[PDB]
Design a protein around this nucleic acid. Sequence first.
DNA 1: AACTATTTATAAGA
DNA 2: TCTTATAAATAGTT
Lengths: 93, 90
Amino acid sequence: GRKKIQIQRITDERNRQVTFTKRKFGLMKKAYELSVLCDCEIALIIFNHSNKLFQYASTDMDKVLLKYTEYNEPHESRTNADIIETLRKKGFN
Amino acid sequence: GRKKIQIQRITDERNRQVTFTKRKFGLMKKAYELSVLCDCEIALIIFNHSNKLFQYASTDMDKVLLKYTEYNEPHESRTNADIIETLRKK
DNA sequence: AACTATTTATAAGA
DNA sequence: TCTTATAAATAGTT
């Protein structure tokens, strides 16, 4: 963008809202591209800072959530901590 | 990337898994960033081509899913077809 | 398992 | 909303 920003909470409410709208779309777009390219079924659930709900599902949210409940095998599970750990360990590329 | 690619299913089993691994991480990194910048809680559930599960949540998947089931109000709900439509305008 | 040039995303502007 | 300069992700090659 016009300037480099640090990843930390945006304190200006107006800025936070504009950024949320733009970046939410960008995330759904990336989910869309991954689902099509790699034949993935994806659900994304977002609650904003006011706990308003925003959702996306490649095809069918109920289908994915149900598959999730039925899953009975160990699987990759990531949190923000894990992402940050990947970034600490990973090269600059 | 070195070249623009069409958004269509990759049939190269190998290219598919390579692309899957990198873009999965890219999506989760963008989720992380949105969660911090805008003070949001985010969950991602992915079943790959083999129906294997991969999940992310900013803090706690259990919490997000519980709150989702409780949610009563109308809210935005998008699918692939909606995104494709938005992209027609560009 | 890495690098790099390019496409794509987006921060600040309009 | 958009546009547009600039940052970030990633396709292809290694």
